[PDB]
Design a protein around this ligand. Structure first.
Ligand SMILES: CC(=O)N[C@@H]1[C@@H](O)[C@H](O)[C@@H](CO)O[C@@H]1O
Ligand SMILES: [Ca+2]
Ligand SMILES: [Ca+2]
Ligand SMILES: [Ca+2]
Ligand SMILES: [Ca+2]
Length: 182
């Protein structure tokens, strides 16, 4: 049985190898069990300094979501998160606008909708629009990582052509695609 909560299923992975791109982080995820799990109910993390994977920086980064960590990971040089679950969206057009250090990839219903395939100091990208064909819970996943230094990850989403943006949070997230009443 999988937990039903108003959030995405979160996994954290650390490494002492360099993360340069999405492929490197995805290979890390494939290579082992998560170093920690958590509920990603308020997806606006950071900003902090001095490596996400060191000390209590992950806790600080995750903030309101850190109380759901399964463990306190030990130190690593590099690290990142893999989030998966569902997001309620009505049919229509949307676009992400993401602030991040380092890179990331967001997919909805199996298609990338926001990609930065490289390391970077803090930068905000307004991504191209995509369509949702049928109202309801859409499949979503995210990866983000820190190669070292500062760290921040705030995907925001617009339903109104980029006039207003919102954080993905417990209003619309579901871990399993069932309706959460939490
Ligand atoms: C203090 C600071 O912003 N450091 C950033 C670091 O977070 C980022 O990962 C790197 C990418 O090459 O550029 C920088 O060094
Ligand atoms: Ca794994
Ligand atoms: Ca720690
Ligand atoms: Ca590194
Ligand atoms: Ca960094």
């Amino acid at each position: 049985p999988d937990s039903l909560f108003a959030g995405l299923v979160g996994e954290y992975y650390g490494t002492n190898s360099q993360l340069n791109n999405i492929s490197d982080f995805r290979a890390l995820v494939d290579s082992k069990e998560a170093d920690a799990t958590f509920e990603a109910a308020n997806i606006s993390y950071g900003r902090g300094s001095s490596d996400v994977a060191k000390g209590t920086h992950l806790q600080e980064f995750l903030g309101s979501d850190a109380s759901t960590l399964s463990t306190d990971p030990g130190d690593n040089t590099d690290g990142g998160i893999y989030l998966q679950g569902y997001v309620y969206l009505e049919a229509g057009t949307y676009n992400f606008k993401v602030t991040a250090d380092d890179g990331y990839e967001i997919t909805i219903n199996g298609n990338p909708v926001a990609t930065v395939d490289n390391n970077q100091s803090v930068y905000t990208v307004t991504h191209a629009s995509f369509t949702i064909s049928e109202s309801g819970y859409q499949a979503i996943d995210m990866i983000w990582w820190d190669q070292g230094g500062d760290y921040v990850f705030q995907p925001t989403l617009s339903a109104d052509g980029g006039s207003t943006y919102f954080v993905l949070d417990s209003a619309i997230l579901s871990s399993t695609g069932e309706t959460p009443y939490t």
